[PDB]
Every structure is written in structure tokens, then in C-alpha cells.
Amino acid sequence: MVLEVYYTSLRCRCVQESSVFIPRRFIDRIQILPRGNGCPRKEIIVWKKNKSIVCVDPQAEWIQRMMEVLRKRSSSTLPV
């Protein structure tokens, strides 16, 4: 899996947000676009293994919990 963070100032890419759980095993990439002057909200786009591309609510509990896993394994992926 690949996490991409775009430190850009472009217009919003998402017109809706989904809060539906996406199991990590189905995720090929996650793209995070922090908000800025181009888009007034943080966007999180999940690229699923079946090629679906899903804008996700960045305040959804399941994505927050996932992001904590990704943060804590960003220097070592060893499960300790």
C-alpha cells in the first residue's frame, strides 16, 4: 500500500464524501490532500483494488484509526 500526501493548492477534487468502512486489504493507495487556499477542506481519496476511487470523510472514525496505524509504522513496518 502507498500513502500519497499532496502539498498542493489546487481546487477540491471531491464532490461528496463517503463514511463507509473500507477494509485495509482492499486499499491500493490512499491520497491525502490537506486543505489550503484552493480547497477549504481536507480530502482523502482511497484507491480500491477493484479500481473504485472513493472520496472518504476525513472525520470518519475508521479512517482516523487507520491513519494512526500508518503514522506509527511510517519508519518501521515491524508490528511492535
Author numbering: 0 to 79
What is written in the article reporting this PDB entry?
CXCL13 is the cognate chemokine agonist of CXCR5, a class A G-protein-coupled receptor (GPCR) that is essential for proper humoral immune responses. CXCL13 is an agonist of CXCR5, activating the receptor, resulting in downstream calcium signaling and ultimately the chemotactic response for which chemokines are named. As elucidated from structural data on many chemokines, this conserved tertiary structure consists of a disordered N-terminal region (6–10 amino acids, referred to here as the chemokine N-terminus), followed by a long loop known as the ‘N-loop’ ending in a short 310-helix, a three-stranded β-sheet and a C-terminal α-helix. Furthermore, we were able to utilize two of these mutants to solve the first uncomplexed crystal structures of human CXCL13. These structures allowed us to observe that the core domain of CXCL13 (i.e. everything except its N- and C-termini) is fairly rigid, whereas its N-terminus exhibits striking flexibility as well as a propensity to form both intramolecular and intermolecular β-strand interactions.
Upon administering both WT and Met CXCL13 to these cells in a dose-dependent manner, we observed that both functioned as agonists, albeit with differing potencies and efficacies. In particular, we found that WT CXCL13 had an observed half-maximal effective concentration (EC50) value of 2.49 nM, whereas Met CXCL13 had an EC50 of 26.3 nM. In terms of efficacy, we defined the maximum activity elicited by WT CXCL13 acting on CXCR5 at the highest concentration tested (1 µM) to be 100% (defining it as a full agonist) and our negative control of buffer alone to equate to 0% activity; our receptor-independent positive control, 2 µM ionomycin, produced a response of ∼119.6% relative to WT CXCL13 (data not shown). Using these parameters, we observed that Met CXCL13 had a maximum efficacy of 86.8% when administered at 1 µM, classifying it as a partial agonist of CXCR5. We were able to solve the crystal structure of Met CXCL13 to 1.88 Å resolution. We utilized the structure of CXCL10 [chemokine (C-X-C) motif ligand 10] to perform molecular replacement and generate an initial model that was then iteratively refined to generate the final structure. Further inspection of Met CXCL13 indicated that there is one monomer per asymmetric unit that forms a crystallographic dimer with a symmetry mate. We next observed the specific interactions that allow the formation of the β0 strand in the Met CXCL13 structure. One set of interactions are the typical hydrogen bonds formed between the β0 and β1 strands to create the parallel β-strand interaction and the four-stranded β-sheet. We also observed that the initiating methionine itself (Met0) was responsible for helping to stabilize this unique feature with both intermolecular and intramolecular interactions.
